[PDB]
Amino acid sequence: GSSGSSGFRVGERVWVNGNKPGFIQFLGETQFAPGQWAGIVLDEPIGKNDGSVAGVRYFQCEPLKGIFTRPSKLTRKVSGPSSG
Numbered sequence: 230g231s232s233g234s235s236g237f238r239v240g241e242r243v244w245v246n247g248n249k250p251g252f253i254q255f256l257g258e259t260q261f262a263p264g265q266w267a268g269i270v271l272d273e274p275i276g277k278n279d280g281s282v283a284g285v286r287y288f289q290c291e292p293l294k295g296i297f298t299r300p301s302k303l304t305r306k307v308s309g310p311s312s313g
Contacts, residue, residue, distance in 0.1 A: 236300035237267060244304040245269050245296060249276075254288035259297065261285045267300045 237243050241253050255268030261282045274293035280286055282297060 236265075237303065242306070243267075243269055243300075244306060245271070245298060245302075247304045248307075249296075250306075251294075251296070254290070254295075259285070259287070262297075264299065266297045267303065269296050269298065269303070270294055271296060 237253055237256075239253055239256055242250060243253055244250050249271055251269035251271040253267060253269055255266070257265055259266045259282070268287055270288070270290045271294045274291075276293045276296040278297065279292045279295050280288050280290045288295070
């Protein structure tokens, strides 16, 4: 039993939009927008930003390979385990 576990950490594999994997680099509230954000590095060019949002930088990634969204709006791979 892990006990606890609220969100994801830095360097974890998350699935954005329930169909967009990516490695997390930044975590916590941002400067451009309030609220704890979660920077995700998309593997394919299907995002919006690339490490910088409206000029504000956070991490180094590839073009169209970086998006910012709330952790609660993320999934863990494409499977869907159960309790039995």
